[PDB]
Amino acid sequence: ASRLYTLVLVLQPQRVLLGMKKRGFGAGRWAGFGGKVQEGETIEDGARRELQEESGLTVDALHKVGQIVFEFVGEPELMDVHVFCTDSIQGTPVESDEMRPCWFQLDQIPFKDMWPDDSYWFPLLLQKKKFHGYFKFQGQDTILDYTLREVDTV
Numbered sequence: 094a095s096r097l098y099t100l101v102l103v104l105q106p107q108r109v110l111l112g113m114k115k116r117g118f119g120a121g122r123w124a125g126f127g128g129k130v131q132e133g134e135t136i137e138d139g140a141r142r143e144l145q146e147e148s149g150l151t152v153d154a155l156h157k158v159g160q161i162v163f164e165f166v167g168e169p170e171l172m173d174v175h176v177f178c179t180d181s182i183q184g185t186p187v188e189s190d191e192m193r194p195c196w197f198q199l200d201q202i203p204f205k206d207m208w209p210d211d212s213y214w215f216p217l218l219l220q221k222k223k224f225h226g227y228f229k230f231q232g233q234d235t236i237l238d239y240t241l242r243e244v245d246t247v
């Protein structure tokens with residue numbers, strides 16, 4: 094019982110792009126760009142489509158960097174999030190009704206205003222490591238349990 098999601102981090106040598114979600118699930122937190130994968134669509138194509146929809150940016154090659162499974166207690170469906178990174182984009186970031194993008198210097202990543210799991214795996218992403226993670230949440234603020242390990246193959 095899991096549903097496929099994508100998450101894309103535009104990670105350049107000295108900065109990373111995050112977007113402040115304005116409505117819906119996760120509103121009020123900085124995050125990467127992504128969403129649900131459609132019927133008949135590959136995961137990577139879904140990741141590329143959602144980056145465009147939410148940030149206005151065009152990506153070519155996306156690199157697989159992680160898989161994170163999210164459980165919310167009392168909710169049947171697990172979220173199976175496929176995480177990707179890219180350093181080469183086209184376009185400039187677009188603020189819309191749904192998302193406000195902003196660049197962050199790597200020493201100024203706003204962890205207090207991000208999902209709490211990011212403190213665990215974002216440092217791996219910044220050092221070009223790949224990972225498998227699992228986070229069990231109660232509500233949107235409390236991590237009850239988690240696992241996280243580095244992998245050679247996502």
Ligand SMILES: Nc1nc2ncccc2[nH]1
Pocket residue numbers: 119124163172208209210211
């Ligand atoms: N970073 C992050 N994104 C998430 N989306 C849904 C649930 C938990 C999440 N943690």
